[PDB]
Amino acid sequence: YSGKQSYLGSIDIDISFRARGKAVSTVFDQDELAKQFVRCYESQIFSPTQYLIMEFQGHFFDLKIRNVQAIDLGDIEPTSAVATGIETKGILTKQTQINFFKGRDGLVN
Amino acid sequence: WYAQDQSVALSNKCFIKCADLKALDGQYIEASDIYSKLIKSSMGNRLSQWSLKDYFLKKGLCQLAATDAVAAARTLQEGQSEDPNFADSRESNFLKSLIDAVNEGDSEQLSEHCKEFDNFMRLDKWKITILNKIKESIQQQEDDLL
Amino acid sequence: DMTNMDTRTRHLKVSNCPNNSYALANVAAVSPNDFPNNIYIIIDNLFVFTTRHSNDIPPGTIGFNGNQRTWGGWSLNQDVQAKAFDLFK
C-alpha cells in the first residue's frame, strides 16, 4: 500500500489519565515511556487517532496518536510532511522520535 | 400473543414487565432488546411518547449495566435524533451524564448525577438496582485496576 | 535459620499479586522450587522481602503488590534480579 514510506519517523502521542481520580504528581520520564512503547509493541502498524491503554509502573494511561510521519529507509532527512490523515501508516522502530503532549484533560505532568 | 392479535398496548405492557424483570434478573442485553422492541412499537404514537422518553433511558441504563457504554451512547443519540421530545427531556440529559461518568470512571460523579435526577424526578427500585450494579461494576473495575 | 541457602541470582517477572491476602502479608510469595520458606531475599540489591511458599505462583516468577511497584517504580511483566539476603553480615 505505502510502497516506500514503511517506517515511523516522528510520532506525537497525547497522554491522558484514564481515571480523573488517579491523578499523580509523579514525574514521568518520556524516554522511559518511549522505551516501554518500543519494548511492548514492536513491528506494529499504527494510524493517527488510534487509541491505546498503557500500564506504566501500575498507572493506566490513555494514549492517542495525534499525528504520524511516515518515512522510507535511506532518507537521511525527514523531508516528508507530517500527515494527520488516517491514510498514513507505518512500522514502529527503535529510533522513532516520540513526542508526548498533554491530553485534552491536561492532568498528566 | 398480544402482538399476534395486534394489541399493541397490551403487548407493550407485557414487554415492559418482561424487560423490567429481565433487567432485575441480570439479563441486561435481553432487557435492552425488549426495550428496543417497545421503542419501535411505540414510535409515531402520540399516546405512548413519555413511555418512549423512559424507554430510551431504561434501555441505556441496561446497556450501561452490561458495561457497554458505547451502546448506551448510540441509544442516546438515536433517541435524541428520532424523538424531539426525548432530546430535550431530563431523561436524555441524565443518560448522557451517566454515560460520561462511566466513561471517566467517576463513581462519585455518577452518584451526584443520580441525586440530582432524584431531586426533580424520583427514582424507582428498578433504576436503583441498575445503578447500584453499575456502581459495583465501577468498583470491580477498580479491583481490575489492581 | 539463614546459615545455609542457595544464593544464586534469579531473574523473575513482576506480576499482579495473587490476591488481597498475600498483598496484606507483604511477603514475597514464591514457589517451593524457587527458594526455601521464611527466608529474607533481596531484589536489585535494594528491596528486601520475606519469602513464603505459594503454589499459585509458578517457579521463576515473583509476585508484588502495587505499593512495592510504586517503591521500585516497576511495571507489570518487568524483569528483576533476586538473590538471597543476609542482613546480619
UniProtKB/Swiss-Prot annotation, chain B:
The similarity annotation says: Belongs to the SNAP family.
Q: What is this protein called?
A: Alpha-soluble NSF attachment protein
Write out the function statement from the record. SNARE complex protein that binds to cis-SNARE complexes on membranes and is required for vesicular transport between the endoplasmic reticulum and the Golgi apparatus and for homotypic vacuole fusion. During the priming step of membrane fusion, is released from cis-SNARE complexes by SEC18 to establish a pool of unpaired SNAREs, which are required for interactions in trans during docking and fusion steps. Can displace HOPS from SNARE complexes, which may be a prerequisite for trans-SNARE complex disassembly and subsequent rounds of priming, docking and fusion.
Underlying gene: SEC17
- Its membrane topology: Peripheral membrane protein
Give the main location. Answer: membrane
Q: Which GO terms describe its molecular function?
A: ATPase activator activity; soluble NSF attachment protein activity; syntaxin binding
Tell me a GO biological process for this protein.
intracellular protein transport
Name where it's found.
Membrane
Q: Where is this cross-link: Glycyl lysine isopeptide (Lys-Gly) (interchain with G-Cter in ubiquitin)?
A: 115
- The lineage's top-level taxon is Eukaryota
Q: Give Gene Ontology CC terms.
A: cytosol; fungal-type vacuole membrane; SNARE complex
Keywords (alphabetical) are: Acetylation, ER-Golgi transport, Isopeptide bond, Membrane, Protein transport, Transport, Ubl conjugation
Q: How does it assemble?
A: Binds to vacuolar cis-SNARE complexes composed of the v-SNAREs NYV1, VTI1 and YKT6, and the t-SNAREs VAM3 and VAM7. Interacts with SEC18.
Curated annotation (Swiss-Prot), chain C:
Q: Which domain of life is it from?
A: Eukaryota
Q: Where in the cell is it found?
A: Cytoplasm
Describe the family membership recorded for this protein in Swiss-Prot or TrEMBL.
Belongs to the AAA ATPase family.
The subunit structure is:
Homohexamer. Binds to SEC17.
What other comment is given for this protein?
Answer: Present with 5920 molecules/cell in log phase SD medium.
Q: What does this protein do?
A: Required for vesicle-mediated transport. Catalyzes the fusion of transport vesicles within the Golgi cisternae. Is also required for transport from the endoplasmic reticulum to the Golgi stack. Seems to function as a fusion protein required for the delivery of cargo proteins to all compartments of the Golgi stack independent of vesicle origin.
What is the name of this protein?
A: Vesicular-fusion protein SEC18
Gene symbol? SEC18
First and last residue shown, out of the full length, are 18 to 106 of 758
